[PDB]
């Protein structure tokens, strides 16, 4: 198969499980509070920071380089605005850094530092959902918490350098399909995408526990 198809098939079952975690079921129903939302967003701040640091480190490596779209995709600067919005001018002192977020960040550093050929698993898992279902959660969050259409507090979910999320996803898939790909790399990429989903599920189960 093509790498973009392999990855979609490989993660379709775990996507179903992730969508139905308690935290995400509550989110989807509009039951997301400012408390829960700040927890998850601060956690994403550390995750995208590590992911994008490792993307920087490996930007010239042919095992990742074709997916190098900082201007279009990178989320850290957006996450920093959201952090100043949600936690105030001293957000760096204030934001939580949970065990599950730490675990996800540590795997991101291992992949980026020792297994860069798997980095595409982690970019795929985060960015492509951001450009899909993340747009649906954005509308739900705005309605649940009364966030203005103008976008404050939801910069993470807004891609000002992408005209069309769907056409962009399609370009990105096509580029994923030009990575030099052996059966070895392909097997391990799809397995690493399953682990990335699990890391997100464990984050959700932890935030949920923290909230109840
Ligand atoms: C309840 C929460 C979620 C909802 C409502 C949701 C919804 C969706 C939707 C509607 C799509 C587009 C599917 C299609 O048309 O084929 C999608 C794709 C995707 N989602 Fe989610 N999702 C959720 C949770 C997650 C989580 C936790 C992750 C990963 C951490 C994730 C990652 C992805 C990825 C990587 C894709 C792209 C699949 C592909 O096109 O290859 N989603 N999701």
Curated annotation (Swiss-Prot):
It is found in: Endoplasmic reticulum membrane. GO terms for biological process: angiogenesis; cellular response to arsenic-containing substance; cellular response to cadmium ion; cellular response to cisplatin; cellular response to heat; cellular response to nutrient; epithelial cell apoptotic process; erythrocyte homeostasis. It is an enzyme of class 1 (oxidoreductase). Its main location: endoplasmic reticulum. Keywords: Apoptosis, Endoplasmic reticulum, Heme, Iron, Membrane, Metal-binding, Oxidoreductase, Phosphoprotein, Transmembrane, Transmembrane helix. Homodimer and higher order homooligomer. Oligomerization is crucial for its stability and function in the endoplasmic reticulum. Interacts with FLVCR2; this interaction is potentiated in the presence of heme. Belongs to the heme oxygenase family. This is Heme oxygenase 1. The chain holds residues 11 to 222 of 289 of the full protein.
């Amino acid at each position: 198969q093509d790498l973009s198809e392999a990855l979609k098939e490989a993660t379709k079952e775990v996507h179903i499980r992730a969508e139905n975690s308690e935290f995400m079921r509550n989110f989807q129903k509009g039951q997301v509070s400012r408390e829960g939302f700040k927890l998850v967003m601060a956690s994403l701040y550390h995750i995208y920071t590590a992911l994008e640091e490792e993307i920087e480190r490996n930007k010239q490596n042919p095992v990742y380089a074709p997916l190098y779209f900082p201007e279009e995709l990178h989320r850290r600067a957006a996450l920093e605005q959201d952090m100043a919005f949600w936690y105030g001018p001293h957000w760096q002192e204030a934001i939580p850094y949970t065990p599950a977020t730490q675990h996800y960040v540590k795997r991101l550093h291992e992949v980026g530092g020792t297994h860069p050929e798997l980095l595409v698993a982690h970019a795929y898992t985060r960015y492509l959902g951001d450009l899909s279902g993340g747009q649906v959660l954005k509308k739900i969050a705005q309605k649940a918490m009364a966030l203005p259409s103008s976008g404050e507090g939801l910069a993470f979910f807004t891609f000002p350098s992408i005209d069309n999320p769907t056409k962009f996803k399609q370009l990105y898939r096509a580029r994923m399909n030009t990575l030099e790909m052996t059966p070895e790399v392909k097997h391990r990429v799809t397995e690493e995408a399953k682990t990335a989903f699990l890391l997100n599920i464990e984050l959700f189960e932890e935030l949920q526990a923290l909230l109840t």
